[PDB]
From Swiss-Prot:
Family classification: Belongs to the protein kinase superfamily. Tyr protein kinase family. ABL subfamily.
Residues represented out of the complete protein: 229 to 515 of 1130
Lineage of origin: Eukaryota, Metazoa, Chordata, Craniata, Vertebrata
Residues annotated to bind ATP: 20-28, 43, 88-94
Localization of this protein: Cytoplasm, Cytoskeleton; Nucleus; Mitochondrion
Residue runs in coiled coils: none
Expression across tissues: Widely expressed.
Protein name as it appears in the record: Tyrosine-protein kinase ABL1
UniProt organism field: Homo sapiens (Human)
Function, as annotated: Non-receptor tyrosine-protein kinase that plays a role in many key processes linked to cell growth and survival such as cytoskeleton remodeling in response to extracellular stimuli, cell motility and adhesion, receptor endocytosis, autophagy, DNA damage response and apoptosis. Coordinates actin remodeling through tyrosine phosphorylation of proteins controlling cytoskeleton dynamics like WASF3 (involved in branch formation); ANXA1 (involved in membrane anchoring); DBN1, DBNL, CTTN, RAPH1 and ENAH (involved in signaling); or MAPT and PXN (microtubule-binding proteins).
Length: 287
C-alpha cells in the first residue's frame, strides 16, 4: 500500500481521555496506547479540516525526523478521513500556555535561557537536514516533566534551498510571528524563520507574553514593515537581548546564521551552565 505507515497502528488500541486543546488548539485529546500502557496526545482531523495540508505534513516530517527536542511520533491513522496524529503526552502543554501559568520562582531566567538553548539545538537538526519550521513559536513548542521543552511540527516543511519565497500559500498561522518580508511579499527563507525564533526568545523571556501587546493587528503589519521589533524583556540578560535583537535584524544578508546563534547560546549557557563555579546560585528574574 502507497499510504501505508508502520507508524500507523490500530485506533482501537488507544483509549481516549480529556481533550488537551479542543477549545482553541484544534481537535486535540489525551489517550493511552494500551499495548504499552503509555499516555499519549491524539490529534483528530474530522470537523472543520481548515488545514488538512498542515496536519498531514506533521505526519510526513515526524516520519523523516526523530530527536528528543522535536515532538516524537508515537503513531498515526491516515487510513481514514478523520485523520489521527499520535505523539507523546507533554504534561504542561504548549510552552506559551505553560509560562503564562507557571511558577516564575521555579521557572526562572536560568531555565528560560536553557529552553532557548534546547530549541536552537532542535532547529539546528532541521537546518542541518534542510528542513524549515517557518512557524516557530511557544504555542508550537511543548513542555513536559524535568522542565523539558521540544519544538513541534505545525507547518514544518523541507527548506531544501531556502532561496527566498520557499512557501505554500498558507505558510504561516501566527501573523505577529510572521516576518515583515513574509507579510509584504509572502516570502519565506531560513532568515524569516530566524525572525520567528527571535519572537519565541521574546516569549520565553516575557513568561509567554504576546509580541507587540496592546497595539492593533492592522497596525502590526505597518510597524513591523517600518523595521519595528520588540524591546528587551524585564529580567532578560543584555547578552541574550543582543542575540534576540540580532534575530530581528532588518536585512536577511546581515541577519545571523543558526551557527552564530548557537555559539551565542553556548557561551552564555556556560556562564550559567557551570552551576558549580558559581556558588550560592546565579541569576534571579523576579517579574
Amino acid at each position: 500500500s502507497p499510504n501505508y505507515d508502520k507508524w500507523e497502528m490500530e485506533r482501537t488500541d488507544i483509549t481516549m481521555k480529556h481533550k488537551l486543546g479542543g477549545g482553541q488548539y484544534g481537535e486535540v485529546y489525551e489517550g493511552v496506547w494500551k499495548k504499552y500502557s503509555l499516555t499519549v496526545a491524539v490529534k483528530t482531523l474530522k470537523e472543520d479540516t481548515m488545514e488538512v495540508e498542515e496536519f498531514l505534513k506533521e505526519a510526513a516530517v515526524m516520519k523523516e525526523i526523530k530527536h528528543p527536542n522535536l515532538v516524537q511520533l508515537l503513531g498515526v491513522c491516515t487510513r481514514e478521513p478523520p485523520f489521527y496524529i499520535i505523539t507523546e503526552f507533554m504534561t504542561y502543554g504548549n510552552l506559551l500556555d505553560y509560562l503564562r501559568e507557571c511558577n516564575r520562582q521555579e521557572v526562572n531566567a536560568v531555565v528560560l535561557l536553557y529552553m532557548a538553548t534546547q530549541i536552537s539545538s532542535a532547529m539546528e537538526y532541521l537546518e542541518k537536514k534542510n528542513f524549515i519550521h517557518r512557524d516557530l513559536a511557544a504555542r508550537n513548542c511543548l513542555v513536559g516533566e524535568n522542565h523539558l521543552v521540544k519544538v513541534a511540527d505545525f507547518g514544518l516543511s523541507r527548506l531544501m534551498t531556502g532561496d527566498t519565497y520557499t512557501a505554500h500559500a498558507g505558510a504561516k498561522f501566527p501573523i505577529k510571528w510572521t516576518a515583515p518580508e513574509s507579510l509584504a511579499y509572502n516570502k519565506f527563507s531560513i532568515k524569516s524563520d530566524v525572525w520567528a525564533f527571535g519572537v519565541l526568545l521574546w516569549e520565553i523571556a516575557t513568561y509567554g507574553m504576546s509580541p507587540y501587546p496592546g497595539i492593533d493587528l492592522s497596525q502590526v503589519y505597518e510597524l513591523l514593515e517600518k523595521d519595528y521589533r520588540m524591546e528587551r524583556p524585564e529580567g532578560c540578560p543584555e547578552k541574550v537581548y543582543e542575540l534576540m535583537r540580532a534575530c530581528w535584524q532588518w536585512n536577511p544578508s546581515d541577519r545571523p546564521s543558526f551557527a552564530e546563534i548557537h555559539q551565542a547560546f553556548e557561551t552564555m549557557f556556560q556562564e550559567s551552565s557551570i552551576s558549580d563555579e558559581v556558588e550560592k546560585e546565579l541569576g534571579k528574574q523576579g517579574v
